[PDB]
Amino acid sequence: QLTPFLILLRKTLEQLQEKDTGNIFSEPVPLSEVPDYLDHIKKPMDFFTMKQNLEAYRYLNFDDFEEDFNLIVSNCLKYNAKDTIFYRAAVRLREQGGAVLRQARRQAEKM
Amino acid sequence: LTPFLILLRKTLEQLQEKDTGNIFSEPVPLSEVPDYLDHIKKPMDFFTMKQNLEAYRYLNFDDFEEDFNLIVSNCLKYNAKDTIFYRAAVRLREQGGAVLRQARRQAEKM
């Protein structure tokens, strides 16, 4: 079944990604090219995995959706050095995403 | 062609095998890393070590070990800690230091 909440999370997921021009966070960090990634990051996350989760009914409340967004950001800050395109992008995403998530949660908790 | 040169050849290939990503196989590319020489006084890599070896410039084991240690220390110096490069050098310090320990025992008999 397709609910209003799922529809809202779809919209929210797309809003979080508009803030990401380089598609830095669109797909999993490629482990072939980044072979040390799993030595430092326990639970990788990215926007495509989130969409898979969303469409498979794994985000039945707002907290679990926000948790995975927050993992995208915190994993990136953790893995990358500060003086990088990637770390700077995650700082910006924290800022811009925090705001999108604030208004979406307000809408969700009325359902 | 001495037993010593043959030993260093074998040792060098063993060190290279520890670097699965071939990060240290060739000099750091100055066209991609233009400020490298402003930080690093004496660049080193496994191909340069092979050139030195084949041109008889490793008179003794200490000189060879010194160059291996440079590959590692240069990389820790130049790069930020949270990089593939730095992390790889930290692993190479351990795994390569061990290769050198066993090879030195053999060298010192010659």
Partner: peptide
């Protein structure tokens, strides 16, 4: 450290 080599992994 210098400017860095950039990139993500290799």
């Amino acid at each position: 450290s210098g400017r860095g080599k950039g990139g993500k992994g290799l």
